[PDB]
Amino acid sequence: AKALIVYGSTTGNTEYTAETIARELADAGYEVDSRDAASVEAGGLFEGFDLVLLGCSTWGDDSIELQDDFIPLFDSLEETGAQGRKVACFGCGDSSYEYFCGAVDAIEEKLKNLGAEIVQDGLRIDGDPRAARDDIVGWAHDVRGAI
Ligand SMILES: Cc1cc2nc3c(=O)[nH]c(=O)nc-3n(C[C@H](O)[C@H](O)[C@H](O)COP(=O)(O)O)c2cc1C
């Protein structure tokens, strides 16, 4: 399996999360490409992968705002080759906000409309992901077992 992990992270939390998932798929024998959203170009980005994992933190407080580097990508999602692709989403947030990881929910909804296949319910981390490392390892294992 070739897996691509694309993340948006402003304070490094979602990035730490992505690195952790990368390592677990890599340890498992997958070939893993991990890229910060700041640096990708959307056209045909998902072509050639068996699994695509998209990570993004939630901002805005009063409304949902995706992490900044991720916006350009989200906007161009239909140009990715997501139709019929196996995907799963993850993200960091804080449950004291009214839309707790709303970024995850928007990205899943859009992926569904494009015809991607969501292989597992998204990983929504509340707080410091270093305190939820077992939950992240756990999710990475359930995704592998679903493709
Ligand atoms: C000003 C502000 C607004 C935030 N707004 C939201 C929000 O609407 N929903 C949410 O779940 N988390 C929200 N969070 C918390 C971040 O998503 C959380 O800190 C996450 O760990 C940051 O991830 P990152 O470093 O990868 O960008 C906010 C944080 C700040 C400081």
Side-chain angles (χ1 to χ4, degrees):
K2 271 186 65 221
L4 191 223
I5 290 176
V6 187
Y7 65 83
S9 196
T10 291
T11 76
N13 290 327
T14 299
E15 180 178 70
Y16 165 94
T17 308
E19 288 166 342
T20 296
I21 297 158
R23 173 78 291 147
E24 285 308 287
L25 294 189
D27 275 1
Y30 279 57
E31 296 185 52
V32 175
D33 192 333
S34 193
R35 303 188 192 166
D36 184 314
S39 86
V40 308
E41 267 175 277
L45 179 66
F46 310 161
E47 324 219 82
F49 283 104
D50 306 302
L51 177 70
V52 177
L53 291 188
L54 260 20
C56 185
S57 52
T58 310
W59 295 89
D61 183 351
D62 79 285
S63 69
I64 294 169
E65 308 228 56
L66 267 59
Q67 197 272 157
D68 55 272
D69 298 314
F70 208 92
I71 295 160
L73 174 65
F74 184 77
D75 272 346
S76 285
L77 234 30
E78 55 184 67
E79 278 185 55
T80 59
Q83 183 178 300
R85 198 70 54 171
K86 278 168 190 310
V87 301
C89 296
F90 54 99
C92 280
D94 187 312
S95 60
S96 72
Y97 288 95
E98 146 151 66
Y99 303 127
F100 172 53
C101 280
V104 190
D105 313 326
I107 296 166
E108 287 186 350
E109 213 38 54
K110 184 96 221 177
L111 255 2
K112 295 186 249 216
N113 293 323
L114 276 188
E117 190 178 324
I118 292 152
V119 307
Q120 190 62 47
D121 288 330
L123 176 55
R124 290 165 176 82
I125 294 167
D126 180 11
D128 194 335
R130 302 155 190 86
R133 191 165 181 292
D134 305 329
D135 293 315
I136 302 174
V137 164
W139 183 91
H141 250 277
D142 304 352
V143 322
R144 276 206 294 87
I147 57 154

